[PDB]
Coordinates of C-alpha atoms in Angstrom, one line a residue:
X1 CA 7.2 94.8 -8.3
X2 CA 6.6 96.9 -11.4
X3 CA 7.3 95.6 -14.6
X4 CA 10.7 97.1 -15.4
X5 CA 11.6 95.3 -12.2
X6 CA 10.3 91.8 -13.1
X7 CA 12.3 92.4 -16.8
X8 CA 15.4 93.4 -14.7
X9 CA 15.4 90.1 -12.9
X10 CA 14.5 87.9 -16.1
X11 CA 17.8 89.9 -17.6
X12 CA 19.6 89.2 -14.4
X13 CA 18.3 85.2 -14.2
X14 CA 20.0 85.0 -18.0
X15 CA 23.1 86.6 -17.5
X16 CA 24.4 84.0 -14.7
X17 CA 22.1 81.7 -16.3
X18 CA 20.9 80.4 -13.0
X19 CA 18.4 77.5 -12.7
X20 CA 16.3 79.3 -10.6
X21 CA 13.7 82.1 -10.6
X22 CA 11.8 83.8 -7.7
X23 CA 9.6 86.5 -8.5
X24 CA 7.3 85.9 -5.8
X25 CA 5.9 88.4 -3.7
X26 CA 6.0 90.8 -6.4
X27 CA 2.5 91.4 -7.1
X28 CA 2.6 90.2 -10.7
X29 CA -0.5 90.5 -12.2
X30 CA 0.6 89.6 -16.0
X31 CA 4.2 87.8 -16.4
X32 CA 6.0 89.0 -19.1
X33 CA 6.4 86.5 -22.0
X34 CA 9.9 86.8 -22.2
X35 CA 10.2 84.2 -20.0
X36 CA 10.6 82.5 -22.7
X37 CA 14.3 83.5 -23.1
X38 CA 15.0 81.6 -19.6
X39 CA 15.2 77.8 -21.2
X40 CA 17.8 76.9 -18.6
X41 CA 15.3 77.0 -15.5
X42 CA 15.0 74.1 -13.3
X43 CA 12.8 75.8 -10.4
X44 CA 10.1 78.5 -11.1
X45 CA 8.9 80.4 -8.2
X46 CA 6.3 82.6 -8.7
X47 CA 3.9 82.3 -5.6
X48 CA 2.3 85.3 -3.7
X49 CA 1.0 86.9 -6.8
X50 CA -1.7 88.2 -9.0
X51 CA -1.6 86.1 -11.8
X52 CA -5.0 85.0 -12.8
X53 CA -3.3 82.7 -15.6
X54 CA 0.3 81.8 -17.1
X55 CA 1.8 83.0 -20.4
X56 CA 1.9 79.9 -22.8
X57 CA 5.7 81.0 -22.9
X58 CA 5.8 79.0 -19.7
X59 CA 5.6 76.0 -21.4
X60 CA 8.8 76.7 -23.8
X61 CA 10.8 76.0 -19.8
X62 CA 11.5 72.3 -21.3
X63 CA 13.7 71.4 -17.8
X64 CA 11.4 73.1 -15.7
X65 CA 11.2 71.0 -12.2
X66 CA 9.5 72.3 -9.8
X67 CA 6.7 75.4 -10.4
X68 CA 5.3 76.9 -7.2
X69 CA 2.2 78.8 -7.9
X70 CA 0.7 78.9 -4.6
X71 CA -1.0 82.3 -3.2
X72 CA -2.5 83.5 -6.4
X73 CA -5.8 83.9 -8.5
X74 CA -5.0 81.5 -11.0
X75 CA -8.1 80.3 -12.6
X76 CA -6.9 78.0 -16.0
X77 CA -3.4 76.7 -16.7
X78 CA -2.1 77.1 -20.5
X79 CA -2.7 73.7 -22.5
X80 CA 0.6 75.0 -23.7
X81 CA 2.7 73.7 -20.3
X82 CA 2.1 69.7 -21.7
X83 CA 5.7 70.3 -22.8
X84 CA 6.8 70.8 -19.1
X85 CA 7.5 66.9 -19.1
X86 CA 10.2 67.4 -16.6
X87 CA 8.1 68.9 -13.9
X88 CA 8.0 66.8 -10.6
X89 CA 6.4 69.6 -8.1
X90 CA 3.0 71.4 -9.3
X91 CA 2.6 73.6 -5.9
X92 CA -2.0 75.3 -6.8
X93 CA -2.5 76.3 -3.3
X94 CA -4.3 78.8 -2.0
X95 CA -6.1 80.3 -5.9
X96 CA -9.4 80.1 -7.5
X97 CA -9.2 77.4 -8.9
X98 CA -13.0 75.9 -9.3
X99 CA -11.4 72.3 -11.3
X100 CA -8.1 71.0 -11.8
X101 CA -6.7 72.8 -15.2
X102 CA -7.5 70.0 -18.0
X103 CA -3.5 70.3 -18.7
X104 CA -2.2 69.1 -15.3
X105 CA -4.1 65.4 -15.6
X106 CA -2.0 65.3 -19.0
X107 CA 1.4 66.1 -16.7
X108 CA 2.5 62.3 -16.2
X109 CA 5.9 63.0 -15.0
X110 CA 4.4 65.0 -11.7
X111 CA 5.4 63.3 -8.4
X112 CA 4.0 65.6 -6.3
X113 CA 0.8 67.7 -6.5
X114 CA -0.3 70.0 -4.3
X115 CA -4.3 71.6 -4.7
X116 CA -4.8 73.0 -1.3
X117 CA -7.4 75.5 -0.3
X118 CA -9.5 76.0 -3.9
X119 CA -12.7 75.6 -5.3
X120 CA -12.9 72.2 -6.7
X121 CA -15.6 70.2 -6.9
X122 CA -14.9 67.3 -8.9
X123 CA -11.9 65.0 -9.6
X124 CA -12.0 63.6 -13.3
X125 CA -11.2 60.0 -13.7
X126 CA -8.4 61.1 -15.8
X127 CA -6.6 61.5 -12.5
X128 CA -5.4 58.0 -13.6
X129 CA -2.5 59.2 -16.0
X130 CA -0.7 60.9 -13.0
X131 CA 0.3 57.2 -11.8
X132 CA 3.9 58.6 -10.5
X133 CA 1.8 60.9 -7.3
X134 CA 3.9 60.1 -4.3
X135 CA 1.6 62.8 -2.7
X136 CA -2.0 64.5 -3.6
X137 CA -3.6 67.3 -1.6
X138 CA -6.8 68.2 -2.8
X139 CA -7.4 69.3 1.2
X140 CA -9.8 72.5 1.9
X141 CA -11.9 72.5 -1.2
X142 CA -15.3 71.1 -2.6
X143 CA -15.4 67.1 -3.4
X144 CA -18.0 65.5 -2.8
X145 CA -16.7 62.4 -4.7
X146 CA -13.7 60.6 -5.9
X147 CA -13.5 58.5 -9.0
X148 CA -12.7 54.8 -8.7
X149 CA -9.9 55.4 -10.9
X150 CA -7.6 57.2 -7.8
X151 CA -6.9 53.3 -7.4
X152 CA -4.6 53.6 -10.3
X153 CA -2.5 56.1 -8.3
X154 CA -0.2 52.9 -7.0
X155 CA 2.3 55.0 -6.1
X156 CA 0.9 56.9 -3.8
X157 CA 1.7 57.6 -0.3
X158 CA 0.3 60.5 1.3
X159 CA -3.3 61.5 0.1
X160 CA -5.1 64.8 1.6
X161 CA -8.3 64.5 1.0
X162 CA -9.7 66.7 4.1
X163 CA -12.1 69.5 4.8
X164 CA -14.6 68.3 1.7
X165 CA -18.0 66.9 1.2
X166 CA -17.2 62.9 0.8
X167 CA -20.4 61.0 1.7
X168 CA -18.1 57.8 0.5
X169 CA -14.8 56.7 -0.7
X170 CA -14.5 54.1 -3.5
X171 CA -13.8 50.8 -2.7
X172 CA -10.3 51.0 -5.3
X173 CA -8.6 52.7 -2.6
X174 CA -8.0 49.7 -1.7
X175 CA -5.7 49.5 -4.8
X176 CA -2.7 52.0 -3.1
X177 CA -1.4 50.1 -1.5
X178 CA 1.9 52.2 -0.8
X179 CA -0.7 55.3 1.3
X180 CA 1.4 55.5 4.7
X181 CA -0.8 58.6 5.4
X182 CA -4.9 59.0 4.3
X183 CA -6.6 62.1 5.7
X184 CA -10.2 61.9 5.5
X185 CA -11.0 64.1 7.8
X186 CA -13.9 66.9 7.9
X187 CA -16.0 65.0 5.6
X188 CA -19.4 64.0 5.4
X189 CA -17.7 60.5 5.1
X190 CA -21.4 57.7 6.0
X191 CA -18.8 54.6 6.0
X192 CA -15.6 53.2 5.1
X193 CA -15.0 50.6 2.3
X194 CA -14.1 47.2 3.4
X195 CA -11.1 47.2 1.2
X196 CA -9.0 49.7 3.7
X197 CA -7.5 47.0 4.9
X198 CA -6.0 46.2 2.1
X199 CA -4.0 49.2 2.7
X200 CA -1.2 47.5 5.1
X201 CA 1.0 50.4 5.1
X202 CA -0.8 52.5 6.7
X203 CA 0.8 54.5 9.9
X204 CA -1.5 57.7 9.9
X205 CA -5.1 57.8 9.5
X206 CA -7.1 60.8 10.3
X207 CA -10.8 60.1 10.5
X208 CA -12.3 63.1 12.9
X209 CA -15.6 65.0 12.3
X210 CA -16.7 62.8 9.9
X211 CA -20.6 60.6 9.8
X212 CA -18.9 56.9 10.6
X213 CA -21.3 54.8 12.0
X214 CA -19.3 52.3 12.6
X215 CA -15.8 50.8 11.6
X216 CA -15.0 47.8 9.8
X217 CA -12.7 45.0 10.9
X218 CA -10.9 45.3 8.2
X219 CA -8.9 48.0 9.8
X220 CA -6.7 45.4 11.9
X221 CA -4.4 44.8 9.1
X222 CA -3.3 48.4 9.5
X223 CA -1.1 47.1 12.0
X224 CA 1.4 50.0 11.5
X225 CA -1.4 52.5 12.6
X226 CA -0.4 54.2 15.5
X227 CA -2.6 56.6 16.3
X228 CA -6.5 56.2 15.2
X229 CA -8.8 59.5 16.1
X230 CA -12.1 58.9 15.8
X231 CA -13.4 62.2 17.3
X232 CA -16.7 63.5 16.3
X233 CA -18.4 60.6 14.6
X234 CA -21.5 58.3 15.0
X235 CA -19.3 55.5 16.1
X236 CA -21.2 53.1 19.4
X237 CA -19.3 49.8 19.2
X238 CA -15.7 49.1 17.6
X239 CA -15.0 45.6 16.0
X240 CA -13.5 42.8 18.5
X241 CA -10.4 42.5 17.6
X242 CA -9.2 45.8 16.4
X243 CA -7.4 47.6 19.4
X244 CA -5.5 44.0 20.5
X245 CA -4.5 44.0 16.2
X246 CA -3.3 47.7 15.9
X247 CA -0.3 46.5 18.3
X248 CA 1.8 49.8 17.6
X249 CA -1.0 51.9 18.5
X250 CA 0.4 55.2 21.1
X251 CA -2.7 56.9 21.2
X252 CA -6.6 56.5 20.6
X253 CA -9.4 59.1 20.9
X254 CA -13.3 57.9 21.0
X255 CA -14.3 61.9 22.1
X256 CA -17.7 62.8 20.9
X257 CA -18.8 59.9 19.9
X258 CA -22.3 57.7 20.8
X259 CA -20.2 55.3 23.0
X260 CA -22.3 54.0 26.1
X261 CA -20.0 51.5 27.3
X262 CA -16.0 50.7 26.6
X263 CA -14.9 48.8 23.9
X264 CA -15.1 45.7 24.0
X265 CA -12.3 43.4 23.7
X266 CA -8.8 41.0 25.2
X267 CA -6.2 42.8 27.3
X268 CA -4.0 43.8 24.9
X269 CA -6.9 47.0 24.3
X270 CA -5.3 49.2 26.1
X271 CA -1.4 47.7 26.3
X272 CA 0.2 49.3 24.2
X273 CA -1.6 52.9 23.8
X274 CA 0.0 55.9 26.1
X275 CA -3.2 58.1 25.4
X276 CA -7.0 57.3 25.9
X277 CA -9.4 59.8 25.2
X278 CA -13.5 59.3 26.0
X279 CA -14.4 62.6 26.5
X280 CA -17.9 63.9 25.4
X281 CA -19.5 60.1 25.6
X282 CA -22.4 58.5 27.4
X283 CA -19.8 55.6 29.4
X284 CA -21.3 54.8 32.7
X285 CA -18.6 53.1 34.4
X286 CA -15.0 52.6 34.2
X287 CA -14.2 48.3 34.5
X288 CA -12.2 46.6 36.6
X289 CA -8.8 45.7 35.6
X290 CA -9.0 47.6 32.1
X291 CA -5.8 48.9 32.4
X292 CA -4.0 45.7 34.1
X293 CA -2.1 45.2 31.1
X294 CA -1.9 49.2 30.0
X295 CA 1.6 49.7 31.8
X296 CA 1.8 52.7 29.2
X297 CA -1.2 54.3 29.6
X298 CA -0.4 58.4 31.0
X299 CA -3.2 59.9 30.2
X300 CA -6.9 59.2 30.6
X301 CA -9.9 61.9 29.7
X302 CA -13.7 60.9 30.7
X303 CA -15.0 64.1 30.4
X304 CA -18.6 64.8 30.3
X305 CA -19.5 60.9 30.5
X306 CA -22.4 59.6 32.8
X307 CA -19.5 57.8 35.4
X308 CA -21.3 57.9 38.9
X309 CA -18.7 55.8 40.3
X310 CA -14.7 54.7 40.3
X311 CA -13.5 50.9 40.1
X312 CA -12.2 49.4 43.0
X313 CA -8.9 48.7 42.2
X314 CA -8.8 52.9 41.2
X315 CA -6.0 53.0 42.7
X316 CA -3.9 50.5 40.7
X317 CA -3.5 53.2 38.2
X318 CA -0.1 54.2 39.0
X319 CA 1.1 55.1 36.1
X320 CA -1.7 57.6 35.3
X321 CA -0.2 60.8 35.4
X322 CA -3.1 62.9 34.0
X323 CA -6.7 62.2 34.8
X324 CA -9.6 64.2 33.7
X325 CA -13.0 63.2 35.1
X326 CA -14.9 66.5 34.9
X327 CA -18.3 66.6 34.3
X328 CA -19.4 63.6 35.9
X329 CA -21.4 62.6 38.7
X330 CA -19.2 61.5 41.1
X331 CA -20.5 61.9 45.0
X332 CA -16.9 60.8 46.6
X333 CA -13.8 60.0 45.5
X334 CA -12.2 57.2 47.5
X335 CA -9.2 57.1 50.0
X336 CA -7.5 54.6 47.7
X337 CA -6.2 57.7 45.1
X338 CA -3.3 57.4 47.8
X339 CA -2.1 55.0 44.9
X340 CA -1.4 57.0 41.8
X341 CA 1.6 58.0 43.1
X342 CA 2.9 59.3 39.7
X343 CA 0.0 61.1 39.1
X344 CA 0.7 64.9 37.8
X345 CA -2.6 66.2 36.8
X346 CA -6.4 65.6 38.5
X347 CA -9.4 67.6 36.7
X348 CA -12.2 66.6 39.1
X349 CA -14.1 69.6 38.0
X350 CA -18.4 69.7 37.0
X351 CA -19.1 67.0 39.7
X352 CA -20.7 66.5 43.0
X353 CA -17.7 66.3 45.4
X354 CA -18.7 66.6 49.0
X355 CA -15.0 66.0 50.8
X356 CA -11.6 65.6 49.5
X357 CA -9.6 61.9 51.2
X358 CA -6.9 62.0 53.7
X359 CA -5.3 59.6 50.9
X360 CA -4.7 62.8 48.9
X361 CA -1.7 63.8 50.7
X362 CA 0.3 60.6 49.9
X363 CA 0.2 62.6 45.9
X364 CA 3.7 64.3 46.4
X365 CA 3.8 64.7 43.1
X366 CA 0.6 66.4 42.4
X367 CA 0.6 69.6 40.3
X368 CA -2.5 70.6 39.0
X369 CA -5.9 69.8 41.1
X370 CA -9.1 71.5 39.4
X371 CA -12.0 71.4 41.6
X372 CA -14.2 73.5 40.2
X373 CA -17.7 73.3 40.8
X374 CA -18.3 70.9 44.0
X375 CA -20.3 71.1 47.0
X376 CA -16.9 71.5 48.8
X377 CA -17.1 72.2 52.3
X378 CA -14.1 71.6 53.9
X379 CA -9.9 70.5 52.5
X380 CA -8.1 68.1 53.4
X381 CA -5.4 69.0 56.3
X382 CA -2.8 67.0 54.5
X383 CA -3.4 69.5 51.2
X384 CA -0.8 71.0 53.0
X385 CA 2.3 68.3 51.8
X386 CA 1.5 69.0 48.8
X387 CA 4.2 70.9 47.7
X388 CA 4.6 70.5 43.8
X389 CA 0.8 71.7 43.7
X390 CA 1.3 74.6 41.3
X391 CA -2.1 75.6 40.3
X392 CA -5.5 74.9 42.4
X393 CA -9.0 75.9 41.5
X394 CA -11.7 75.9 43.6
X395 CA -14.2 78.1 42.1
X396 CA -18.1 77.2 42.5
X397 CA -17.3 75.5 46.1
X398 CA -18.8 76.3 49.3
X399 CA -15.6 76.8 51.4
X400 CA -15.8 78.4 54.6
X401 CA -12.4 78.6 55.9
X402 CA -8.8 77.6 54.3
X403 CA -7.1 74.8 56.0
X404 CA -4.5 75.7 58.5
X405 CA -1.1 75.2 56.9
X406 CA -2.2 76.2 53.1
X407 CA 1.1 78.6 52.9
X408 CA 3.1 75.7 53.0
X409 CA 2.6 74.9 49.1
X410 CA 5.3 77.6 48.4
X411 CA 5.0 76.4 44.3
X412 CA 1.7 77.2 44.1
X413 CA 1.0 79.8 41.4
X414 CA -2.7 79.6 40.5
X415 CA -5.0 79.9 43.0
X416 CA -8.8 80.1 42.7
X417 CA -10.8 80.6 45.3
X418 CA -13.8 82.4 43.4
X419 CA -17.7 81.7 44.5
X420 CA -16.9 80.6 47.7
X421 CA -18.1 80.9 51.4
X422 CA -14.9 82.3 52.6
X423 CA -15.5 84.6 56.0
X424 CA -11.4 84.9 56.3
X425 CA -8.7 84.0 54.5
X426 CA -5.4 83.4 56.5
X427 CA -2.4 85.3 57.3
X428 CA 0.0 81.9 56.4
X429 CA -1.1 83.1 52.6
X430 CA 1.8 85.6 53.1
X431 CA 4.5 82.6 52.9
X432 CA 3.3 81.8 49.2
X433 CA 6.5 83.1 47.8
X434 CA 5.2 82.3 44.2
X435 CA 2.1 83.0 44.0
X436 CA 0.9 84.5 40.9
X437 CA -3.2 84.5 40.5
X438 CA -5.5 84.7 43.3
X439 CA -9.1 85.1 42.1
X440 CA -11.4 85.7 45.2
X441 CA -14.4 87.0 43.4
X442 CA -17.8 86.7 44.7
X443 CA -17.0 85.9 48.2
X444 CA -20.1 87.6 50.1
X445 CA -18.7 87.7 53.5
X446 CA -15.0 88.1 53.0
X447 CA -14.5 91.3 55.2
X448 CA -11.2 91.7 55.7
X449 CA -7.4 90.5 54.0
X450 CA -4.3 89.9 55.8
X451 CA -1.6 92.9 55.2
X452 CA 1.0 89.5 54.4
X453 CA -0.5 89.2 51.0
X454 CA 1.9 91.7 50.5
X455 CA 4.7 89.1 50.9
X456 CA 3.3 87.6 48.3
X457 CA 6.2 89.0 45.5
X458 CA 5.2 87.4 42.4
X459 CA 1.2 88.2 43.1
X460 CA 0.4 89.8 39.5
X461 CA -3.2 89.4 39.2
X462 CA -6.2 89.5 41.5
X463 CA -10.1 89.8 41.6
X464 CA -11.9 90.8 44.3
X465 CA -15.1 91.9 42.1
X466 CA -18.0 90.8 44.4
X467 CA -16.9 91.6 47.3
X468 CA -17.2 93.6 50.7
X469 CA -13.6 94.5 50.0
X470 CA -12.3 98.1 48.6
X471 CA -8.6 97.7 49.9
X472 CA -5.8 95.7 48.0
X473 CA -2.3 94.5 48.4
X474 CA 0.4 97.6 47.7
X475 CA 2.2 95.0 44.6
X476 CA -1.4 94.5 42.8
X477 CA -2.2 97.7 40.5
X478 CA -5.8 97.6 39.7
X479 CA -8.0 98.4 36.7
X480 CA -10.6 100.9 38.3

């Protein structure tokens, strides 16, 4: 930490002559120029520091590799380190740095370039002389546009470009054609040049919370993508053939977007993808036979979309194993869920459900079944076989009783039976030998509880707030 301690370990880094030099995390706020000494050093750590610049000395490490800097106040590099023309890794993160140091665009021999988390607000189009980048992050700082000249950059392949102010990107993008992975996300990003399709490499391409209108069909020759996140945009319509081109495509996520109907386009949309996201969109209705072809498809999410209705062939979705159409405006849900057999998870939750189907029982394999705010009045007496059912919310129903039989779901962990109608609750709620939550909050007429909640061994957590109820079972300790 002090200086005598720093000079120690230069003396010690000489006398074995190792290649290597780690005085991070030593709150250096000046390194000693005898650094200088040290022309043997291949790798120069120094992150996790004060050092608000570098000793020119630095630049006397001829074979220096690989300079980590990251986690300091560095403000300005010495002109002084053009000599470092050995140096493949230039690691900026996390300093002050309000431009690139002048000195680093004359660093040729830099591979890879790290310039997370700073200040910088422009890129010069002298960025063309580091032609040997493999990567660039210039993620988390202030761009708000890139030169034409980042086209040079031919070697490229991974280019951070993220949390910034780009309106636009330049059309020579187009010209890296080696980028397996572009992050543009949290920009200000209006549109997309034409010429990212020139870009056939490409396997990951981060777009989210951006101001994308719209998409061009350029895209498809990104076959490689496989997943393409387009959360948080502007985006209505896609182009034709884009989903049925992206043929290695594993997920896809349209979530907060202006979308008012589903994509259009051939079967092979939804083959291939094992994920489909819609949540936050303006969809009225699911079609028929969109997922004939999607043998992959797991998981689907329509949350808060303006669905009043389910297909008829619903229940040909059996490999849907999670299914999340909360905040809809569903009335009923049919008898035919009988069919998703496979299906694990079912968020019905923000909607208008009256009754639960008889169909519901056939879902052996049910575990999670959110409910929450319904017009519930009644459950299902075949609730009852399902015996995977793990966690069960029904808060915001208007649930008198509790089917006869519920103790049978001896898995059940979760169980939420706040803001309901609930006079009694049944003494078969003793054989839930699992049962860890029960929330029975604002129940106005729940008098009385059965002493066999006390059988209940795992019962950790309970709310009776709301209540006429002052007595508890002995295993729950209370917070009064």
């Amino acid at each position: 930490s002090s200086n005598a301690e720093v000079i120690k370990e230069l003396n010690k880094c000489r006398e074995e002559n190792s290649m290597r030099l780690d005085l991070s995390k030593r709150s250096i706020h000046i390194l000693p120029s005898s650094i200088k000494e040290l022309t043997q050093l291949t790798e120069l750590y120094l992150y996790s520091n004060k050092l608000q610049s570098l000793p020119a000395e630095v630049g006397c490490l001829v074979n220096l590799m690989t300079l980590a800097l990251s986690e300091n106040s560095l403000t300005s590099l010495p002109d002084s380190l053009d000599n470092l023309k050995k140096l493949r890794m230039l690691d900026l993160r996390h300093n002050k740095l309000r431009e690139i140091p002048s000195v680093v665009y004359r660093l040729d021999s830099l591979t890879t370039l790290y310039l997370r988390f700073n200040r910088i607000t422009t890129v010069e189009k002298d960025i063309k002389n580091l032609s040997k980048l493999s990567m660039l992050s210039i993620r988390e700082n202030k761009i708000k546009q890139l030169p034409a000249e980042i086209g040079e950059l031919c070697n490229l392949i991974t280019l951070d470009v993220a949390h910034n102010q780009l309106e636009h990107l330049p059309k020579e993008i187009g010209n890296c054609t080696q980028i397996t992975n572009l992050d543009l996300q949290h920009n200000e990003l209006l549109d997309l040049p034409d010429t990212i399709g020139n870009l056939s490499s490409l396997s990951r391409l981060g777009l989210r919370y951006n101001r994308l209108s719209a998409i061009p069909r350029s895209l498809a020759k990104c076959s490689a993508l496989e997943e393409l996140n387009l959360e948080n945009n502007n985006i209505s319509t896609l182009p034709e053939s884009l989903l049925s081109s992206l043929v290695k495509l594993n997920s896809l996520t349209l979530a907060r977007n202006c979308f008012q109907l589903y994509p259009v386009g051939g079967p092979s949309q939804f083959s291939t993808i094992y994920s489909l996201n819609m949540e936050h969109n303006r969809i009225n209705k699911i079609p028929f036979g969109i997922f004939s072809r999607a043998k992959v498809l797991s998981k689907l999410n329509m949350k808060d979309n303006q669905l009043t209705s389910l297909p008829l062939d619903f229940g040909t979705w059996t490999s849907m194993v999670e299914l999340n159409l909360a905040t809809n405006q569903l009335t009923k849900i049919p008898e035919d869920v009988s069919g998703l057999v496979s299906l694990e998870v079912l968020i019905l939750s923000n909607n208008l459900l009256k009754k639960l189907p008889h169909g519901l029982g056939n879902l052996r394999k049910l575990r999670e079944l959110d409910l929450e705010e319904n017009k519930l009045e009644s459950l299902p007496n075949e609730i009852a076989y399902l015996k995977d059912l793990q966690k069960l919310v029904l808060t915001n129903n208007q649930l008198t009783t509790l089917p006869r039989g519920i103790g049978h779901l001896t898995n059940l962990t979760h169980l939420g039976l706040g803001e309901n109608l609930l006079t009694h609750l049944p003494e078969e709620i003793g054989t839930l030998e699992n049962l860890e939550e029960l929330y029975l909050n604002d129940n106005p007429n729940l008098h009385s509880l059965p002493f066999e909640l006390a059988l209940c061994s795992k019962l950790s957590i309970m709310s009776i707030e709301n209540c006429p109820l002052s007595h508890l079972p002995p295993q729950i300790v209370a917070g009064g």
